[PDB]
Amino acid sequence: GQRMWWAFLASSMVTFFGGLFIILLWRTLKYLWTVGWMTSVKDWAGVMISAQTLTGRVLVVLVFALSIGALVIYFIDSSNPIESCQNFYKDFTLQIDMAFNVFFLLYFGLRFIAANDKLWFWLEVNSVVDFFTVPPVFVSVYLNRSWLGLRFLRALRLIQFSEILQFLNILKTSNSIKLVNLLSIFISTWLTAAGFIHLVENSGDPWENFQNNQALTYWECVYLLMVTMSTVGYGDVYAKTTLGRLFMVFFILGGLAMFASYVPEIIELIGNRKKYGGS
Amino acid sequence: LNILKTSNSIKLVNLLSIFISTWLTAAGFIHLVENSGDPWENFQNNQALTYWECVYLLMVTMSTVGYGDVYAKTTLGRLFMVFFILGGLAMFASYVPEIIELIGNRKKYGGSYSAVSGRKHIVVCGHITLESVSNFLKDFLHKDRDDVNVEIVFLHNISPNLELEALFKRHFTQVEFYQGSVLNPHDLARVKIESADACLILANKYCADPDAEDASNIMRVISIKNYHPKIRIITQMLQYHNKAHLLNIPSWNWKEGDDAICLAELKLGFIAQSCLAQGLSTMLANLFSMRSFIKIEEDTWQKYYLEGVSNEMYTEYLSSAFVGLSFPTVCELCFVKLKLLMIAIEYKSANRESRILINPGNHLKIQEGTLGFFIASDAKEVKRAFFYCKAC
Numbered sequence: 001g002q003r004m005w006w007a008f009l010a011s012s013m014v015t016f017f018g019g020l021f022i023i024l025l026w027r028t029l030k031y032l033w034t035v036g037w038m039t040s041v042k043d044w045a046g047v048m049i050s051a052q053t054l055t056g057r058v059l060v061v062l063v064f065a066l067s068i069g070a071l072v073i074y075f076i077d078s079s080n081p082i083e084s085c086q087n088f089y090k091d092f093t094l095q096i097d098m099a100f101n102v103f104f105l106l107y108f109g110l111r112f113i114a115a116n117d118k119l120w121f122w123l124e125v126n127s128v129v130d131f132f133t134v135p136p137v138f139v140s141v142y143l144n145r146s147w148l149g150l151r152f153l154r155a156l157r158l159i160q161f162s163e164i165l166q167f168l169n170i171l172k173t174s175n176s177i178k179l180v181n182l183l184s185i186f187i188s189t190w191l192t193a194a195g196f197i198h199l200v201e202n203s204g205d206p207w208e209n210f211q212n213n214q215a216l217t218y219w220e221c222v223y224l225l226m227v228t229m230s231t232v233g234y235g236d237v238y239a240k241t242t243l244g245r246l247f248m249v250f251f252i253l254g255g256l257a258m259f260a261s262y263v264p265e266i267i268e269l270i271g272n273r274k275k276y277g278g279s
Numbered sequence: 280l281n282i283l284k285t286s287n288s289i290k291l292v293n294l295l296s297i298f299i300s301t302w303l304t305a306a307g308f309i310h311l312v313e314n315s316g317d318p319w320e321n322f323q324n325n326q327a328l329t330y331w332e333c334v335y336l337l338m339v340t341m342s343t344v345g346y347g348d349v350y351a352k353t354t355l356g357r358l359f360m361v362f363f364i365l366g367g368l369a370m371f372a373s374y375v376p377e378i379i380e381l382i383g384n385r386k387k388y389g390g391s392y393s394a395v396s397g398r399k400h401i402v403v404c405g406h407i408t409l410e411s412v413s414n415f416l417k418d419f420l421h422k423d424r425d426d427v428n429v430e431i432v433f434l435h436n437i438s439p440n441l442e443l444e445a446l447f448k449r450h451f452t453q454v455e456f457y458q459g460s461v462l463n464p465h466d467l468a469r470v471k472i473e474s475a476d477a478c479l480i481l482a483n484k485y486c487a488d489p490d491a492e493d494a495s496n497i498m499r500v501i502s503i504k505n506y507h508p509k510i511r512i513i514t515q516m517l518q519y520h521n522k523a524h525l526l527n528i529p530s531w532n533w534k535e536g537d538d539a540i541c542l543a544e545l546k547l548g549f550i551a552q553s554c555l556a557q558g559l560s561t562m563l564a565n566l567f568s569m570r571s572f573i574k575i576e577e578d579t580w581q582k583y584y585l586e587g588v589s590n591e592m593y594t595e596y597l598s599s600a601f602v603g604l605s606f607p608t609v610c611e612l613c614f615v616k617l618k619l620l621m622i623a624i625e626y627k628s629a630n631r632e633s634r635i636l637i638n639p640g641n642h643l644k645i646q647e648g649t650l651g652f653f654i655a656s657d658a659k660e661v662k663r664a665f666f667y668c669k670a671c
C-alpha cells in the first residue's frame with residue numbers, strides 16, 4: 001500500500017507528550033485551583049526494584065540479559081529493507097521482540113510506582129527510551145507491517161549497567177566504578193550515533209520526494225563515526241544528504257571533546273599494574 | 280536591561296556570541312569569494328556553491344576533521360584558508376571545552392523530601408564519611424533488633440564521592456540524601472524538621488584541634504534549636520569542660536526528651552569502674568553492639584567467648600501479676616521459668632523527680648506499671664514478660 005511511516009512515530013509521540021499533560025493537570029486539578037496500603041505497595045515495588053531479596057535479584061539479572069538481547073535483535077533487523085511486511089502468525093522473530101517488550105513494559109511500570117516525585121522521573125534518560133521503543137512493536141503487530149525508524153534508541157539501555165551492577169554488591173571501589181561508568185557512556189554514544197546515521201541516510205531526506213538515497217550498512221556507519229570522532233579523517237565515506245550533514249556538524253560541535261578526554265582516562269585506569277608484586 | 284547579574288552567565292553568553300559571530304562571518308566571506316571568480320583570470324574559474332555548503336566546510340575545517348568532499352578551489356579562497364587556520368584552530372580548541380564545562384554544572388542532589396503519613400523520619404548532620412556512615416548504618420538496621428520502621432535522612436555541604444554512593448544506593452529503600460547546609464534556615468526547612476522525631480549529630484573523634492570541633496557542634500545545636508524549640512537532640516562532645524555550655528541554651532530539657540553523650544567522661548569512666556575488677560570494660564562495651572550468635576567447633580576460647588558476645592540489653596514493661604511479690608523471688612522466677620536475666624528497676628517514688636535504682640534489695644515490692652531492664656540474645660525473647668499465668 002501507500003507509505004505508512006508517519007503512523008508509527010505518532011503513536012509514540014502521543015504517549016510522551018500526552019503523559020506530561022495528564023501529570024501537569026493532576027498537580028493543577030485541585031479544588032483550590034492552585035499506614036496506607038498505597039504506601040505498602042510503594043515499599044514492595046521499591047524493594048523489588050533493587051537487590052533486596054531473591055526475587056528482585058533474579059529480576060535485575062533478567063533485565064541485564066534482556067537488554068543485550070534486544071540490542072542483538074536490532075542488528076539482525078538492520079539489513080532488511082526500510083519498510084515492508086512480516087506476517088505475525090508465521091515467523092519466530094518479531095515474537096522475541098514482542099516478548100522482550102512486554103517484559104520491558106512491566107519493568108517500566110514497577111519503576112514508575114516506586115518513585116518519590118513523578119514529574120522529574122517521567123523526563124529521565126532511561127524513561128524516554130522505553131517511551132520511544134515500546135509502542136511501535138504493538139502497532140506493528142496491529143498492522144502486520146513494521147518499520148525500522150527510531151529503533152536505534154534501543155541501544156541506549158546500556159547506560160543502566162552501572163546501577164544494575166551496584167545493587168548486586170559487585171563493585172565497591174572508586175576505580176572500578178569510574179572505569180565501568182566511562183566505558184558504558186562511551187559504547188552507548190558510539191552505537192547510538194551509528195544508528196542515527198543509518199536511518200536518515202539510507203532513506204531519502206523528504207525535502208525532495210525521497211530520491212537522494214546512498215546505500216550503507218550499519219557497520220559502515222560505525223566506521224564513519226569512528227573516523228570522524230578521532231579527527232583522523234579519510235575520504236572513504238562521507239554522508240551526502242542534507243539531514244546527515246547537519247547532524248554531522250552538530251555532533252562534531254560537541255562530542256569530539258568526549259573522545260579527546262575519556263580515552264586518556266580509560267587508558268590510565270587500566271594498566272596501573274603493580275610490576276613488583278608476587279612472592 | 281539588568282538580566283545577567285551573576286558571574287558564570289556573563290562568561291557563557293560572551294563565549295557563545297563571539298563563536299557564532301565569527302563562524303557565520305567566515306562562512307559569508309568564503310561564499311562571496313568563491314561564487315565570484317578572480318580578477319586576474321577575467322572571472323573564469325567560478326565554483327558553484329550555496330551558503331549551506333560553505334558553513335559546512337568551515338565547521339569541517341575548524342575542528343580538524345577534514346574531508347575530501349568540498350574544498351575551495353580559487354587562489355583567494357586558499358589564501359584565506361591558509362591564514363584563517365592559524366587563528367581558528369586555537370579558537371575552537373580553547374573555546375569548546377570551556378563552553379561544555381560552564382554549562383551542565385548542575386547540582387544533582389537538589390530537591391526536597393516528602394512527609395508520608397503513618398511512619399517516622401529522622402535527621403543527621405555532621406562528620407559524614409565512609410567509616411562513620413557504615414558503622415552507624417550497620418548498628419541501626421541490624422536484623423536482631425525489634426521490627427524497625429523508620430527512614431534515614433542525611434545532610435552535608437560536600438557532594439558525596441563515588442565510594443559512598445555505593446552505600447547510599449544499596450539501601451535504596453531506607454536512606455535518602457539532600458545536599459545543603461545546617462546553618463541556613465532554608466535548608467532546615469527542606470528536610471522538614473518540623474515533623475521529625477530527633478536529629479543525631481556525628482562528631483569527628485580524630486580531630487587535630489579538639490576545640491574547633493566541639494565549637495562547631497555547639498553552634499549546630501544552637502541553630503537547630505533556633506529553628507524549633509520542641510525538638511529532640513542527641514549529640515557528641517569531646518571534653519567535659521565544654522560539655523557544660525550546652526546545659527545553658529534555653530530549650531534543652533534533660534528531664535524530658537533530651538540527652539548528651541560525651542566521650543572523655545565515658546572513656547575514663549569505663550577505665551576507672553574497671554579498676555576495681557579486671558575486664559569489666561569489655562563486658563560493658565560488648566553489650567552495646569548488635570551481634571548475632573555464631574558457630575565455632577575448635578576447642579579454643581573463641582567459641583566459649585562468642586557464646587556470650589552476641590548478648591544485648593533491652594527494656595520492657597512488666598506484667599501486672601508480679602506487683603505483689605519480692606524482687607529476689609521475681610528474679611529467681613524470671614531466670615528459672617524464662618532463662619532470662621534482669622539487672623535493675625526503673626523508678627519507684629510517688630514524686631515528680633525520676634531516679635534510677637540498680638539491683639534493689641529486699642525492702643521493695645513491685646508497683647503496677649513498672650519498666651525493667653533485661654539482658655538476652657534478641658528482643659523478641661525479652662517480650663515474654665507480658666504475662667506468665669497458665670504457662671508451664
Ligand SMILES: CC(C)CCC[C@@H](C)[C@H]1CC[C@H]2[C@@H]3CC=C4C[C@@H](OC(=O)CCC(=O)O)CC[C@]4(C)[C@H]3CC[C@]12C
Pocket residue numbers: 075076078079187218219222
Ligand atoms: C567495536 C565494538 C563496540 C563492537 C562493534 C560491533 C560491530 C562492529 C558488529 C557487532 C555485531 C555486528 C552485526 C552482527 C550480525 C550482522 C548480520 C549480518 O548478516 C545479515 O544481516 C544477514 C543477511 C545479509 O547477509 O544481508 C550483517 C552484518 C551484521 C548486522 C553485523 C554488523 C557489524 C556488527 C554490528
Ligand SMILES: Oc1ccc(-c2onc(C(F)(F)F)c2-c2ccc(Cl)cc2)c(O)c1
Pocket residue numbers: 005082149150199200203204205206
Ligand atoms: O525512513 C524515513 C526516515 C525519516 C523520515 C523523516 O521524514 N521527515 C522527517 C522529519 F524529521 F522531517 F520529520 C523524518 C524524520 C527525521 C528524524 C527522525 Cl528522528 C525521524 C523521522 C522518513 O520520512 C522516512
Ligand SMILES: Oc1ccc(-c2onc(C(F)(F)F)c2-c2ccc(Cl)cc2)c(O)c1
Pocket residue numbers: 311312315316318
Ligand atoms: O563578486 C565579486 C567579489 C569580489 C570581487 C573583487 O574583485 N577584486 C577584488 C580585490 F580584492 F582585488 F580588490 C575583489 C574583492 C576582494 C575582497 C573583498 Cl573583501 C572585496 C572585493 C569582485 O570583482 C567581484
Ligand SMILES: Oc1ccc(-c2onc(C(F)(F)F)c2-c2ccc(Cl)cc2)c(O)c1
Pocket residue numbers: 207331
Ligand atoms: O531547504 C531547507 C529547509 C530547511 C533547512 C533547515 O535549516 N536549518 C534547519 C534546522 F533544523 F536547523 F532548523 C532546517 C530544517 C531541518 C528540518 C526540518 Cl523538518 C525543517 C527545517 C535547510 O537547511 C534547507
Ligand SMILES: Oc1ccc(-c2onc(C(F)(F)F)c2-c2ccc(Cl)cc2)c(O)c1
Pocket residue numbers: 319354358
Ligand atoms: O598571480 C598572482 C598575483 C598575486 C598573488 C599574491 O600573492 N600574495 C599576495 C598577497 F596576499 F600577499 F597580497 C597576492 C595578492 C593578493 C591580493 C591582491 Cl589584490 C594582489 C596580489 C598571487 O598569489 C598570484
Ligand SMILES: [Ca+2]
Pocket residue numbers: 423570571572589590591655656657
Ligand atoms: Ca543477639
Ligand SMILES: [Mg+2]
Pocket residue numbers: 116452455
Ligand atoms: Mg523514599
